[PDB]
Amino acid sequence: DIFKGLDSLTNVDLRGNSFNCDCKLKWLVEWLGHTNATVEDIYCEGPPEYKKRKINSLSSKDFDCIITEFAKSQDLPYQSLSIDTFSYLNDEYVVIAQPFTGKCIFLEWDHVEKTFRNYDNITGTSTVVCKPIVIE
Amino acid sequence: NVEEETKYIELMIVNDHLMFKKHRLSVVHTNTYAKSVVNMADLIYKDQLKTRIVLVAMETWATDNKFAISENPLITLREFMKYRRDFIKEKSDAVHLFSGSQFESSRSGAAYIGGICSLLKGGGVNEFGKTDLMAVTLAQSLAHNIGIISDKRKLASGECKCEDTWSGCIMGDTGYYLPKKFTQCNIEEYHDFLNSGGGACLFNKPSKLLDPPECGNGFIETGEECDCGTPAECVLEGAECCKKCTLTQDSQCSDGLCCKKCKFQPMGTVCREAVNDCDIRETCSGNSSQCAPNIHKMDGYSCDGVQGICFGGRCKTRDRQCKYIWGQKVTASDKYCYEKLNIEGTEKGNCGKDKDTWIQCNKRDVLCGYLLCTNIGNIPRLGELDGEITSTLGRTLNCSGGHVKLEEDVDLGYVEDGTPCGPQMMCLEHRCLPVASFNFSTCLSSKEGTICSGNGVCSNELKCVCNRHWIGSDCNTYFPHN
Numbered sequence: 001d002i003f004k005g006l007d008s009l010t011n012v013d014l015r016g017n018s019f020n021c022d023c024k025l026k027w028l029v030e031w032l033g034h035t036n037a038t039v040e041d042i043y044c045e046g047p048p049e050y051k052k053r054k055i056n057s058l059s060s061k062d063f064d065c066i067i068t069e070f071a072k073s074q075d076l077p078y079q080s081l082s083i084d085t086f087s088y089l090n091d092e093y094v095v096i097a098q099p100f101t102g103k104c105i106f107l108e109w110d111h112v113e114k115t116f117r118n119y120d121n122i123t124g125t126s127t128v129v130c131k132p133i134v135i136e
Numbered sequence: 137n138v139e140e141e142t143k144y145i146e147l148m149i150v151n152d153h154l155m156f157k158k159h160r161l162s163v164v165h166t167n168t169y170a171k172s173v174v175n176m177a178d179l180i181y182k183d184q185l186k187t188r189i190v191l192v193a194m195e196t197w198a199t200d201n202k203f204a205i206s207e208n209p210l211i212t213l214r215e216f217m218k219y220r221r222d223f224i225k226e227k228s229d230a231v232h233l234f235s236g237s238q239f240e241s242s243r244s245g246a247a248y249i250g251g252i253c254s255l256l257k258g259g260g261v262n263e264f265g266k267t268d269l270m271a272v273t274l275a276q277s278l279a280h281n282i283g284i285i286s287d288k289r290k291l292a293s294g295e296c297k298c299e300d301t302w303s304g305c306i307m308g309d310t311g312y313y314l315p316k317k318f319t320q321c322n323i324e325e326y327h328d329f330l331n332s333g334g335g336a337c338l339f340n341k342p343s344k345l346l347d348p349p350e351c352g353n354g355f356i357e358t359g360e361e362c363d364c365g366t367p368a369e370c371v372l373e374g375a376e377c378c379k380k381c382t383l384t385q386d387s388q389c390s391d392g393l394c395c396k397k398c399k400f401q402p403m404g405t406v407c408r409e410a411v412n413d414c415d416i417r418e419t420c421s422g423n424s425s426q427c428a429p430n431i432h433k434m435d436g437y438s439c440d441g442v443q444g445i446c447f448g449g450r451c452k453t454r455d456r457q458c459k460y461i462w463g464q465k466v467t468a469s470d471k472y473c474y475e476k477l478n479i480e481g482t483e484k485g486n487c488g489k490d491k492d493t494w495i496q497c498n499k500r501d502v503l504c505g506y507l508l509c510t511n512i513g514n515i516p517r518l519g520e521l522d523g524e525i526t527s528t529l530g531r532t533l534n535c536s537g538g539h540v541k542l543e544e545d546v547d548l549g550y551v552e553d554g555t556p557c558g559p560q561m562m563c564l565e566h567r568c569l570p571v572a573s574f575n576f577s578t579c580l581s582s583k584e585g586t587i588c589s590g591n592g593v594c595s596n597e598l599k600c601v602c603n604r605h606w607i608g609s610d611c612n613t614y615f616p617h618n
Contacts, residue, residue, distance in 0.1 A: 007168075008164055008165060008168040010165070038160070
């Protein structure tokens with residue numbers, strides 16, 4: 001939406017440029033569907049599916065960027081062989097076991113920093129799996 | 137003085153649907169287009185006239201034309217003005233029509249001469265054209281409305297001419313190549329009009345504009361506590377008063393005559409001396425930076441003991457009528473011609489305009505019939521001659537008269553309405569009639585047959601302006617003060 005912050009527009013030129021029509025240009029589609037100035041025809045000198053193709057007929061949501069990409073949100077430092085979840089006190093606690101340290105680490109959803117901090121370190125030696133069950 | 141003061145003409149633009157369709161039916165484009173035209177005309181007027189044209193409002197008809205639209209500039213102008221009278225009510229010094237219907241005449245725009253600050257005359261019509269073209273047309277029409285017109289007698293005599301001899305001047309027929317300079321007779325007519333009292337409503341600063349709050353635009357608008365303009369020109373005027381649209385420590389003003397050296401001036405100071413007897417001197421309120429609102433003698437007040445009457449702040453005599461119609465050297469003739477020509481005669485003395493059977497004028501009063509002056513020149517300053525100028529000759533007097541016309545149906549050749557014939561005896565429909573014909577209102581008076589309790593003069597707003605050391609509204613109580 002780079003043309004935002006402008007008013008009383010009559011015409012624009014967009015010639016001699018090889019715009020690659022993609023998500024960055026999606027709003028242009030919307031803009032070309034919304035603005036009613038005297039701007040001449042504009043072409044997608046871009047993706048092979050749109051060879052010099054007009055944006056007026058071309059749509060934006062056809063190549064919309066779906067928001068589902070696994071973002072790296074945290075990096076704990078300790079080895080992790082088996083992970084689990086369980087709703088205790090309506091809190092979805094997580095038990096990331098550890099095979100090498102020989103310790104059954106607990107984690108909880110911290111509501112203040114939006115993080116995961118230590119909750120309990122169950123002892124043992126060379127564990128494999130810590131399956132938590134909630135009976136009554 | 138009053139001429140050097142910054143005039144503020146509150147203009148409102150009426151727009152028809154022809155140019156709305158020509159502008160691709162866009163409201164915002166038309167709005168910004170009108171703003172640009174107003175700014176361009178203000179830039180024209182700022183160089184010499186020192187007058188800012190404030191676009192107070194504007195109306196554009198996205199639907200269609202309300203009234204009949206004709207190629208005749210006069211008929212279309214009459215229709216626009218009557219529509220303004222019927223519907224338009226907001227206060228505006230000028231009401232100008234951008235005519236989408238391009239007039240089929242030779243003149244660019246049709247505006248009344250000296251008609252500003254009037255309900256039925258304050259504005260004109262400007263036809264469709266290019267941005268610069270209709271900007272020039274609006275400038276010419278607003279010059280017309282303020283009495284600034286090209287002087288035909290001086291054009292013929294060469295007394296004053298266009299200093300932009302390259303492409304002519306603005307007042308003439310609009311050439312493609314626009315000039316940049318007005319003639320000196322334009323400014324001289326401006327001083328003559330302002331000194332006569334006309335254009336008294338151009339001395340108010342609007343608080344609301346079509347422009348968003350802009351720092352340094354020369355007007356203290358909404359959201360701006362003070363405004364001295366751009367700091368480039370703020371040094372000369374209001375340097376310590378307002379800075380960057382903000383006050384400088386302890387301050388009370390930004391500009392204005394009633395506030396010298398950024399501080400309040402003493403009470404009783406005259407921020408505007410009266411131009412003539414029809415004007416009333418204005419004194420600052422003591423806490424307002426801007427000068428007092430323009431107040432003139434109410435319509436019907438005489439310029440002198442008997443002769444002359446102030447209408448709209450402008451003096452009117454038979455001599456003044458001859459001066460405006462014919463010229464300064466032309467003066468009104470004596471009662472001899474009035475009683476020896478208006479009683480009986482064709483083309484020489486006539487009450488009403490009837491070519492076939494001229495209207496007879498009685499001997500009771502002959503001062504509203506044919507306007508008779510002395511030493512009428514070859515051509516009048518403005519108007520046209522319906523045929524030839526009438527000339528008629530113990531005392532011998534050079535007796536003359538005419539049928540000077542105008543862009544309106546009213547004939548300037550006869551005596552204008554309201555010219556005195558005697559005690560409370562003034563022209564109405566080419567006849568001497570009393571005040572009861574005009575139904576002039578009575579100001580705030582307490583005694584019988586007096587104005588403002590005798591001592592004091594009522595202003596144009598039908599409100600008493602009592603004399604010195606008289607604070608009462610109706611001039612009844614004396615309050616000494618220092």
